[PDB]
Ligand binder design. Structure first.
Ligand SMILES: *[C@@H]1O[C@H](CO)[C@@H](O)[C@H](O)[C@H]1NC(C)=O
Lengths: 48, 48
């Protein structure tokens, strides 16, 4: 009942669509306690 | 430092004087502004 805590995944291009590997990005952000130092892009239109 | 925006205004101007801070008039243009957010209470320079 002593166990090493980690269990490395096994990857084979043969595996089921689920046991196959899947990359993740979590776009986390922590919000609204300081000056903003990011924005989304601000559009522009040609000048008349 | 203004609400976590840290601002610099500055000048280089030529002179010819022996002793004291020259009497006269010139203004400082804004140079840069950085949203550093922190609480500066004190500061030091850097000689070489
Ligand atoms: C800056 O200082 C004020 C007063 O101590 C405090 O309310 C604020 O939470 C501080 N902010 C940071 C980023 O430490």
């Amino acid at each position: 009942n002593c166990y090493f805590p980690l269990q490395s995944y096994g990857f084979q291009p043969t595996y089921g669509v689920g046991y196959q590997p899947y990359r993740v990005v979590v776009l986390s952000f922590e919000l609204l306690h300081a000056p903003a130092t990011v924005c989304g892009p601000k559009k522009s239109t040609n000048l008349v | 430092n203004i609400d976590g925006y840290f601002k610099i205004y500055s000048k280089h101007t030529p002179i010819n004087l022996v002793r004291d801070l020259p009497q006269g008039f010139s203004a400082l243009e804004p140079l840069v502004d950085l949203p550093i957010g922190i609480n500066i209470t004190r500061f030091q320079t850097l000689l070489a």
